[PDB]
Design a protein around this ligand. Structure first.
Ligand code: NAP
Ligand code: VJJ
Length: 313
């Protein structure tokens, strides 16, 4: 249930998404991350942005303390937020994440986004987001030093487009390739071409919003189609006697995509590990590939006007 990364470490192919909006109490992240670990998740996805690293790290330490897992059985990810791109800010941000979780290292540290912000959402007096210009090759060199230090076992990026990934791959004296690019990916935005490019470079694509996103009104149009109501996914859930969420997760695994799944619901957290219990046929995969429609749920002025907006290409 693992994939081997390009630096030789292993990443579990199903991960637990931990983000929940500020209206959910912080204590819920502790409880649901324990439940996820109990259910069998071994890859846990967090970030500075999520304001939950203390609770998530406590859930992991608690499951280590009670004998359920060892540290080495857990793959924990955190992410550099975009106000900390300046290379001198990278290691201190990572050390702050580690102190919050009370862990000695993360399994994976990512650049959360290429869209640099003034050193969470800095805004000018009108309401406009304040951007920054940073050479992300320098950010990347700071990430590589964090791996050399043992602060992160592996390092990768998120929300990069092909051009952005090439800039890092082509960097003079690159030491470590990104292990992964974590991006929005689901059957209405399946990233087929980006996935090919990643496979060609032995980089793993990690899908977020694989179940169609939380549809948070801050970034998602509530008029957008609801992925888990899709009629093809419904028809395939009835064929397999599973659920449309499980169809959408299994689709990713069969394409060689590592897939995240957030749920703060006890039943759905346990449901999602059923993804390993069945498989889809080629005609089933073809039907899901046919749903692709260039639909990114995160679709906001706060991204689309950024000079480094990943969806410009
Ligand atoms: N790198 C980035 O910029 C980025 C961006 C977005 C997401 N992420 C990561 O990816 C994680 C997952 O993405 P996401 O937060 O967009 O959510 P998601 O995984 O697409 O889930 C969307 C909704 O699906 C529901 N759900 C889960 N299992 C289900 C099931 N079996 N049946 C029916 N509904 C189900 C959940 O509601 P309930 O909680 O009510 O079950 C969740 O709110 C995030 O938590 C975060 O870790 C990263
Ligand atoms: O990481 C998340 O779960 C997450 C949750 C809320 C907002 C968000 O913002 C960005 C989304 C896409 C690109 C850059 C930033 C990310």
């Amino acid at each position: 249930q693992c994939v081997k990364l390009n630096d030789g470490h292993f990443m579990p192919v199903l991960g637990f998404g931990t983000y929940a909006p500020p209206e959910v109490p912080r204590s819920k992240a502790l409880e649901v991350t324990k439940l996820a670990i109990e259910a069998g998740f071994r890859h846990i996805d967090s970030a500075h942005l999520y304001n939950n690293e203390e609770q998530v790290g406590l859930a992991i330490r608690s499951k280590i303390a009670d004998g359920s897992v060892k540290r080495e059985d857990i793959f924990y990810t955190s992410k550099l937020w975009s106000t900390f791109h300046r290379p001198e800010l990278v290691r201190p941000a990572l050390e702050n994440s580690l102190k919050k979780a009370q862990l000695d290292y993360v399994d994976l540290y990512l650049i959360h986004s290429p869209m640099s912000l003034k050193p969470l959402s800095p805004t000018d007096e009108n309401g406009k987001v304040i951007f920054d210009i940073v050479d992300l090759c320098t950010t990347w060199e700071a990430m590589e030093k964090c791996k050399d230090a043992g602060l992160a076992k592996s390092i990768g990026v998120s929300n990069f487009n092909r051009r952005q990934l090439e800039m890092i791959l082509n960097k003079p004296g690159l030491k470590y390739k990104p292990v992964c690019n974590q991006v929005e990916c689901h059957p209405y935005f399946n990233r087929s071409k980006l996935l090919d490019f990643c496979k060609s470079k032995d980089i793993v694509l990690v899908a977020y919003s694989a179940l169609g996103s939380q549809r948070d009104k801050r970034w998602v149009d509530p008029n957008s189609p609801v992925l888990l109501e899709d009629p093809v996914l419904c028809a395939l859930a009835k064929k397999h006697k599973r659920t449309p969420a499980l169809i959408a997760l299994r689709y990713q695994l069969q394409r060689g995509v590592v897939v995240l799944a957030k749920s703060y619901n006890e039943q759905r957290i346990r449901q999602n590990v059923q993804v390993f219990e069945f498989q889809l046929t080629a005609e089933d995969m073809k039907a899901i590939d046919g749903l692709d429609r260039n639909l990114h749920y995160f679709n906001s002025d706060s991204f689309a006007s950024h000079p480094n907006y990943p969806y410009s290409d």
